[PDB]
Structure formats: structure tokens, C-alpha cells
Amino acid sequence: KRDAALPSWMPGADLPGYLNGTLPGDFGFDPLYLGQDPVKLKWYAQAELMNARFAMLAVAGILVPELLSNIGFSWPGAGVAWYDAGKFEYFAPASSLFGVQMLLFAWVEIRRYQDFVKPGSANQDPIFTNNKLPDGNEPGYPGGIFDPFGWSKGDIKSLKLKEIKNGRLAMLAFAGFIGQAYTTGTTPLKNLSTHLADPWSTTVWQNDLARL
């Protein structure tokens, strides 16, 4: 029932009606019909943004620090694998940092949830009542102070599509870090260098067959 004008993950394939192009990155991909129920699909829409946005930060936070180290840039945290940052010693114990993390995140996340439950109800500064977000914001897209440079005032639809495409690719990359790190046992950029050294004999088929 989905129209044929919209982009399709599989050209010439029938696609669900409930994926009608409203959401960004709507390519009609749902072989398991997870998002069939509108109430559930409403939740999954925000979950994708949240998992995507954190994934984009996480991937950026796992490649750039390693990229700088190879270039030779020197800082005390240089040369630490992304999966060894936890063991590293900081100014405060890991437990104390974790406790502060949850208290800070509890405020912002409940603030974000309140808007999702009732959009527009969490757009006012509790202390300095003069401050406020624009009233037209939708769940997942606060705007206002969260968009200081006004990029959202342009072609918003294209920007939403660009965000979700980069976000979906970032989420796949992070799963690659866990799979690659758990198998190869080395940092991600090291795996890329190995592949570029000998692309033909360094496939996952070669690597995994050797192990077993």
C-alpha cells in the first residue's frame, strides 16, 4: 500500500503502509513488522534518534582519539585503547564519577521524557523563567538553545534525513568495534591498516577460519 514514489530499500518490493515517509529515513524497511502498531512505532522513532545520536558521539570518541595518537599528538590519555579507558586512572575514582553521571543524567533524561509524554510542556527554564524554547518544537528536536546557529531554519527535511543516515551508519560502526575488538583483539584503526596492507588475504573469512 506504500506508494512507489518513495525511496525503497529493495526496489520493486511491496512495503508496509504505515511507513508512509513521515519519519526521516523512511525507506520502508521492516521485514519483521516491529513498527506496525502506531503506539510502538512512536516509541521506536525516539529510540532510534537516541541510540543513533549517542552512537555518533561514541564512534567519534573512539576514532579521533586514536587518530591523533598515530599522528604523534601527545596528551596524557594518548595510546589508550577505547576498551581500556575504564581501567585508566583519573583524578577521581570510577565509582564517584559514575554516581555523578547518573544524578546529572537523571535530570536531563526525565526532562526529555516529560516533553515526549506531553510535547511542549518542558520548554521553560525552572530557575530563570525568562528563558524558554520555541513553542513549535517536536519530540526529539528541541531546537531553541539546542540550535544556537539556526541550522534548523533551513531545509529541515533534508537535515533530518542526513542526521538519520549518518546516525544509522554510526550505529553499525560501533557494533563493528565490539565484533572486531572481541575477535581481532586490537584497536579499530589497527584492523583497517591490516586490511589495507593486504586486502585480499585479510577478510573476516581468512581471519576467522584461521582461529577455527
Partner 1 sequence: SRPLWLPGSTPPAHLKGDLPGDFGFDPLGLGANAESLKWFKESELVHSRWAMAAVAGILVQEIVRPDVFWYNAGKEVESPLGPLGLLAVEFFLMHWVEVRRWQDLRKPGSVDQDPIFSQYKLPPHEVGYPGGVFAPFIPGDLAELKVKEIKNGRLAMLAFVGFVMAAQVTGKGPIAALQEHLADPWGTTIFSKAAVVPGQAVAPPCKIPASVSYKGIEIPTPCFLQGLWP
* Neighbour tally for 10: CB within 10 Å: 11
Of the pair 131, 206, the CB lying nearest ligand CHL is at 206
Contact flag: residue 183 with ligand CLA (CB under 6 A): yes
Q: Which is nearer to partner 1, 77 or 176 (CB)?
A: 176
Measured CA to CA, the distance from residue 7 to residue 158 in angstroms comes to: 14
Among partner 1, ligand CLA, ligand CHL, none, residue 200 binds (CB under 5-8 Å by kind): partner 1
Do the beta carbons of residue 16 and residue 7 sit within 8 Å?
no
d(CA 157, CA 137): 14
CA distance 170 to 167: 5
Does 105 bind ligand CHL (CB under 6 A)? Our answer is no
Q: Does 31 bind partner 1 (CB under 8 A)?
A: no
Phi, psi of 141 (to 5 degrees): -130, 80
Question: Is 43 labelled as part of a ligand binding site?
Answer: yes
The one-letter amino acid at 28:
G
The residues binding ligand CHL (CB under 6 A) are 83-84, 86-87, 94, 97-98, 101
Which residues sit at the interface with ligand CLA, rule CB under 6 A? 54, 57-58, 60-61, 64-65, 75, 77, 80, 85, 88, 172-173, 175-176, 179-180, 183-184, 191-192, 194-195, 202-204, 207
